[PDB]
Amino acid sequence: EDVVIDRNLLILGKILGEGEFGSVMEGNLKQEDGTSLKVAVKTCMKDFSHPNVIRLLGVCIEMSSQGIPKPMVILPFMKYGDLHTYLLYSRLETGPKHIPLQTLLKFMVDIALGMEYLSNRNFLHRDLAARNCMLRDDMTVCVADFPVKWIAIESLRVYTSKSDVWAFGVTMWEIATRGMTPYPGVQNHEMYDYLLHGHRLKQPEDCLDELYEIMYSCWRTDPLDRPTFSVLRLQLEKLLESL
Ligand SMILES: CCCCNc1ncc(-c2ccccn2)c(N[C@H]2CC[C@H](O)CC2)n1
Ligand SMILES: [Cl-]
Ligand SMILES: [Cl-]
Ligand SMILES: [Cl-]
Ligand SMILES: [Cl-]
Numbered sequence: 001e002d003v004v005i006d007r008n009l010l011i012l013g014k015i016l017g018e019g020e021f022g023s024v025m026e027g028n029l030k031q032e033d034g035t036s037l038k039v040a041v042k043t044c045m046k047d048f049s050h051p052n053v054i055r056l057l058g059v060c061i062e063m064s065s066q067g068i069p070k071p072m073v074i075l076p077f078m079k080y081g082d083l084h085t086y087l088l089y090s091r092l093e094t095g096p097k098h099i100p101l102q103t104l105l106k107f108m109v110d111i112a113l114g115m116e117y118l119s120n121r122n123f124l125h126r127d128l129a130a131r132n133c134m135l136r137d138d139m140t141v142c143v144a145d146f147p148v149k150w151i152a153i154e155s156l157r158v159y160t161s162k163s164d165v166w167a168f169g170v171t172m173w174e175i176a177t178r179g180m181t182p183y184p185g186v187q188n189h190e191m192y193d194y195l196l197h198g199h200r201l202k203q204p205e206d207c208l209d210e211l212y213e214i215m216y217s218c219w220r221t222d223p224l225d226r227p228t229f230s231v232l233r234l235q236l237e238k239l240l241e242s243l
């Protein structure tokens with residue numbers, strides 16, 4: 001209840017994208033200090049506080065004409081949008097400049113730092129992917145939105161933090177390939193058999209051997225054999241310093 005906001009401080013606009021239970025609308029939130037803030041409205045998070053984890057600005061429950069409730073979650077606006085679509089733009093003219101290797105690692109580290117936070121609070125993401133990572137105006141990444149080619153083999157139906165590491169591994173692959181779909185040539189219904197027979201995501205063309213080892217360690221068959229987010233973050237931070 002301490003999260004709720006009076007709708008009269010909210011103005012909706014265009015549609016930014018399509019979400020799970022409905023569409024996401026841009027909007028203006030009139031802040032306490034009287035100013036107006038650009039926000040995103042989707043049409044457990046308030047306890048989260050971390051720069052690489054999406055913050056919740058509040059919630060609105062607009063009543064309809066018939067009285068059926070229309071809940072709305074107020075989130076920050078990020079002009080650079082989801083990270084998946086950003087990777088695709090970068091390899092085109094007009095879009096963002098060619099993303100260097102170092103910057104790509106900074107994305108991975110940010111995500112790693114964000115998952116380290118949620119994993120310390122023993123919170124499972126259950127849907128980590130490059131599409132669910134947003135780029136702030138300072139080009140830092142934050143996790144949000146908490147599908148077969150991202151799910152861990154053991155979960156194909158048990159889920160732990162080590163499954164988030166699996167998804168994190170795939171996300172690293174998405175980033176290193178600048179927006180490729182996982183498992184080219186393989187179809188969704190073949191994934192369990194494909195993984196069960198020991199096959200994993202192949203190494204990208206220009207990717208570093210020591211960067212592939214890190215993301216490969218995310219797909220070890222035994223979840224307990226996989227590294228924690230704290231180990232992963234430091235490995236990426238150290239690989240980044242060696243450039
Ligand atoms: C995780 C979503 C938080 C909302 N913030 C935001 N800000 C700007 C854009 C944005 C920025 C540029 C262009 C379009 N949308 C955006 N797109 C959504 C991303 C997720 C998707 O499921 C729905 C749309 N979200
Ligand atoms: Cl409105
Ligand atoms: Cl945020
Ligand atoms: Cl962009
Ligand atoms: Cl592959």
Ligand SMILES: [Mg+2]
Nearest residue numbers: 019131132145
């Ligand atoms: Mg999403």
